[PDB]
Amino acid sequence: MNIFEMLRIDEGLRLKIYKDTEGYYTIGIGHLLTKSPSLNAAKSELDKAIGRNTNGVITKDEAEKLFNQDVDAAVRGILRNAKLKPVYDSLDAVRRAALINMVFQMGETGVAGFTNSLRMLQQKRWDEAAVNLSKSRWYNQTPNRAKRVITTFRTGTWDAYK
Ligand SMILES: [Cl-]
Ligand SMILES: [Cl-]
């Protein structure tokens, strides 16, 4: 299992514009298009992202391409972030994937806001960190996915994904 297969399971794949759990326009493997209510503003961002007139529909290759860009951007955002970088450097390979998953879903800013949990992770206080991570809007809104990520942080194995 790796970051790509993990996110593919959490996000799914859809070749037509759809609305995410928050009601925002999305396409492919969790690629957010816009927070704007306009389906036309979405089609426009999509065409811009792909470099062609898509009329709201993309192929599997196009989806994978966006996905490779998004995972790359998530890692690079973590490495450039003064709050995230030290956390990431301290973790083993599996737990690193867990942190990447949160950043992809919520953005660097949002994750950097989990101050207390980040501190606990750095200190390798696994159980404590899992409890603090659960007291969040994130856990209450997307409980099955949050449990999977949290278990990954608690155990350091891919069990939740098998
Ligand atoms: Cl883009
Ligand atoms: Cl969920």
Quick one: resolution in A? 1.6
Known catalytic residue at 11: yes
Residue 106: how many CB atoms within 10 A of its CB?
Answer: 16
Known catalytic residue at 20: yes
Q: Which residue segments constitute the domains of the chain, with CATH numbers given?
A: 1-162 (1.10.530.40)
Sign of CA pseudo-dihedral 92, 63, 110, 148: negative
d(CA 61, CA 68): 11
Helix ranges, 12-114 (H): 39-50, 60-80, 85-90, 93-112
Of these residues, 20, 47, 64, 128, which one is catalytic?
20
